[PDB]
Amino acid sequence: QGKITLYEDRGFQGRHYECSSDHTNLQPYLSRCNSARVDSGCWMLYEQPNYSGLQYFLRRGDYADHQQWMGLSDSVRSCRLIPHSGSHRIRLYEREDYRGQMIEFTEDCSCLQDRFRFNEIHSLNVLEGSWVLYELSNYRGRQYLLMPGDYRRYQDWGATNARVGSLRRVIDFS
């Protein structure tokens, strides 16, 4: 279940901490977390503790700096593990609940505008692992996270809007 080595200082220096499970406060272990090494899994970090604020999606790889994982701010005080899943399947819904149009995805969607018309997703049903939504295509903007569950609106995943441009599955193994 994921396994990364968060480093207070870049180049994997300074104080370090290994996270193999959900964590809400990285302060008591990392002053800033300027570097991170992932073994196998997907991880998300949050600029503020208790998963609140701007975050950064991390996948198997070496990060000697915060800029590597898109770290905008080295003020990372929270990090969690996003579960995986052998198969991947998700059902997005146009409007709230399930009265609008629905389209399913079982693979990477670097260009939703090619698969679904409406750009507003106000409900989705994630059966397998988890997925990620991007305000644009080919991930050139913001990103949201949908854990395995049921959503009846866009606010459920704490989103100002529904505008979705692309999406992928949070997995690279099972």
Swiss-Prot record:
> Per the record, which residues fall in region Connecting peptide?
84-87
Query: Is the Repeat keyword given for this protein?
Result: yes
Q: Which UniProt keywords apply?
A: Cataract, Disease variant, Eye lens protein, Repeat, Sensory transduction, Vision
Residue ranges occupied by any Beta/gamma crystallin 'Greek key' domain in the UniProt entry: 2-40, 41-83, 88-128, 129-171
One Gene Ontology cellular component = nucleus
Q: What InterPro entries would the database entry show? A: Beta/Gamma-Crystallin, Beta/gamma_crystallin, G_crystallin-like
Phenotype upon changing residue 45 to P: In CTRCT4; uncertain significance
| GO MF annotation terms | structural constituent of eye lens
Q: Tell me where the signal peptide lies.
A: none
**GO biological process per UniProt:** cellular response to reactive oxygen species; lens development in camera-type eye; lens fiber cell differentiation; visual perception
Q: Which domain of life is it from?
A: Eukaryota
Question: Any notes on this protein's domains?
Answer: Has a two-domain beta-structure, folded into four very similar Greek key motifs.
Provide the function of this protein.
Crystallins are the dominant structural components of the vertebrate eye lens.
Q: Which disease is it linked to?
A: Cataract 4, multiple types: An opacification of the crystalline lens of the eye that frequently results in visual impairment or blindness. Opacities vary in morphology, are often confined to a portion of the lens, and may be static or progressive. CTRCT4 includes crystalline aculeiform, congenital cerulean and non-nuclear polymorphic cataracts, among others. Crystalline aculeiform cataract is characterized by fiberglass-like or needle-like crystals projecting in different directions, through or close to the axial region of the lens.
> What does the subunit comment say?
Monomer.
The UniProt family comment states:
Belongs to the beta/gamma-crystallin family.
Q: What is this protein called?
A: Gamma-crystallin D
Biological source species: Homo sapiens
